[PDB]
Amino acid sequence: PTIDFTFCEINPKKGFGGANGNKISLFYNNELYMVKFPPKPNGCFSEYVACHIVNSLGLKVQETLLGTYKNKIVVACKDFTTHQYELVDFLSLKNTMIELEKSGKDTNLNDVLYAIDNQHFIEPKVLKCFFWDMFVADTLLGNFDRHNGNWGFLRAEYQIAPIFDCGSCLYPQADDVVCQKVLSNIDELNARIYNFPQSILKDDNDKKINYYDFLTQTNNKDCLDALLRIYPRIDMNKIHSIIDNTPFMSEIHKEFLHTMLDERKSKIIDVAHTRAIELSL
Amino acid sequence: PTIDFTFCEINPKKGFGGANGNKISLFYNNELYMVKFPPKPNGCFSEYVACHIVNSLGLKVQETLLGTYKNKIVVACKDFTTHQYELVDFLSLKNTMIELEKSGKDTNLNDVLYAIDNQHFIEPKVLKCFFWDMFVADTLLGNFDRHNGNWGFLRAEYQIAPIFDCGSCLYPQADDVVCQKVLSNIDELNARIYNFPQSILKDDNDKKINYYDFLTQTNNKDCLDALLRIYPRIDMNKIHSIIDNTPFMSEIHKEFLHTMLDERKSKIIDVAHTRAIELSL
Numbered sequence A, B: 001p002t003i004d005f006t007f008c009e010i011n012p013k014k015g016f017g018g019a020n021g022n023k024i025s026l027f028y029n030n031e032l033y034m035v036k037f038p039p040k041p042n043g044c045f046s047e048y049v050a051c052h053i054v055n056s057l058g059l060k061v062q063e064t065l066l067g068t069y070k071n072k073i074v075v076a077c078k079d080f081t082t083h084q085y086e087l088v089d090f091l092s093l094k095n096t097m098i099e100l101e102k103s104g105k106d107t108n109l110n111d112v113l114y115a116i117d118n119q120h121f122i123e124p125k126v127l128k129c130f131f132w133d134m135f136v137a138d139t140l141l142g143n144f145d146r147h148n149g150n151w152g153f154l155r156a157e158y159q160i161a162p163i164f165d166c167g168s169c170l171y172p173q174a175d176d177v178v179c180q181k182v183l184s185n186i187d188e189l190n191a192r193i194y195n196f197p198q199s200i201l202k203d204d205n206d207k208k209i210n211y212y213d214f215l216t217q218t219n220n221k222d223c224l225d226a227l228l229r230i231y232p233r234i235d236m237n238k239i240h241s242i243i244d245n246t247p248f249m250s251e252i253h254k255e256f257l258h259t260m261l262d263e264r265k266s267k268i269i270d271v272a273h274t275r276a277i278e279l280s281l
């Protein structure tokens, strides 16, 4: 039916960072979880769905289960910093890049790129391939916050940590009234495709990078390679199924995402991929 | 004489967090330090000086060393997450307090206290005494950024992590031109006491807490117990010693502190401490 975490054993000797909603440690089927709570003045859903799409993409993602916790809908992310594994995020790494007078929190794309090539945790080709793999995923999903504290490495010395924190994908602000507006108006819809959301990663002019523009204009062989690579792993029939099998989501929402994913896939990915394909030899 | 870190062996497999500038892991004297660089739109001094003052108050603090790399002036912090020790900040810990539907990054004082009473990493009373300890030293050093991410615990389970990131203390935005301006204009010296810095922490109404006002009107026995506890360790000669003995510091700057420290010492600490005593009986 639907999971319920309410009674599972909490682990009180563990906490989690991040500035959106609380989270606690707890066992489920003999495994530990980080259980994100929603904030309130709907990213629990983005987090579950987005990740499951990333999985279907053959990329290493955190396991995610919708469930209830004391009358609050909750996303449970399997915990990958157990068994004596520690997470160091990219931020902390970029902070070692002292020859750039810019701080690790900074998301200017070129610097981020530079640090990848200059870091010594992971073979820079592996790391660079991952990064763009992730950027494509993020493109499809509309991740508006893949900052340097939203990916990283596990140490026991290092390996890439599974993609996490996709709570910022797929329109977390959208509610049934918004889903409604957009679905009934191509103009609105378009604004949520070309203009916004934008990547948290910046150009050398300090603007957030535009998903559509960037991807349909890049000559970065690394970004282009990763398109040609992930494009085939994309399976709309599955992605829609992930959406259909989302546990609490209203129906109106469910079809907002259906539409939105088809559109993103078609007006950004398809297009960019198609050009990507055309640049060979 | 003075220390050049410039040629010391760097550890290309550890990084560090924080928004304010780069840092790298290197061996000095056979040991890891975290070496913090200055951002360039002065804090390396604040850190060094502030930690040596904290130490002299008898509190457990990171050891600081002031050196040069490549003509940079840089502060070295003895790394305390070597030997399997993993640092975990209060913020994550506060993030688990799901009952207050506020996040683990918000610095509302009451919420913070609640988390102290209700967390299972440290015996609560001990931590309530630490927090308060630190608050007092911050009052002395004038810390405007003691955020839940700026203190925490250590584990291989928990012990309190030595006070770190005190680099936001002791007027870091002030330069030789500012020091002069303050050193002359009394009205200017006044407000860097009665007006700011203010603590990052907050009251129920959202406003940040005024060091002076709070310190001299509060009936929180735990804050006051802290005052009485700490006051007798304030060694004004040793402190001015610490200022005179600072390695690259300019003299106008050296004295800006001397002044500024006497000022906070007598204008807040003394006054508040006096009221404390009289408080019993």
Ligand SMILES: Nc1ncnc2c1ncn2[C@@H]1O[C@H](COP(=O)(O)OP(=O)(O)NP(=O)(O)O)[C@@H](O)[C@H]1O
Binding pocket: A016, A017, A018, A019, A020, A021, A034, A036, A062, A077, A078, A079, A080, A081, A087, A149, A150, A164, A165, A166, A167
């Ligand atoms: N599956 C996981 N296992 C262990 N630690 C995790 C996991 N997922 C996240 N974390 C850690 O917990 C912190 C909070 O998780 P995260 O999903 O990033 O929360 P968030 O509030 O969405 N982060 P953000 O929005 O970028 O400030 C992350 O920064 C990681 O350090």
Ligand SMILES: Nc1ncnc2c1ncn2[C@@H]1O[C@H](COP(=O)(O)OP(=O)(O)NP(=O)(O)O)[C@@H](O)[C@H]1O
Binding pocket: B016, B017, B018, B019, B020, B021, B034, B036, B062, B077, B078, B079, B080, B081, B087, B149, B150, B164, B165, B167
């Ligand atoms: N002595 C130490 N040993 C090991 N780790 C440390 C040490 N000091 C600080 N750290 C860690 O590395 C980070 C260093 O940043 P720190 O200098 O403490 O604050 P900052 O760089 O000013 N950023 P912030 O406090 O977020 O505004 C801290 O957040 C800790 O996680």
Ligand SMILES: [Mg+2]
Binding pocket: A017, A018, A149, A150, A165
């Ligand atoms: Mg995060």
Ligand SMILES: [Mg+2]
Binding pocket: A020, A145, A165, A166, A167, A168
């Ligand atoms: Mg997020």
Ligand SMILES: [Mg+2]
Binding pocket: B017, B018, B149, B150, B165
């Ligand atoms: Mg810090």
Ligand SMILES: [Mg+2]
Binding pocket: B020, B145, B165, B166, B167, B168
């Ligand atoms: Mg600081």
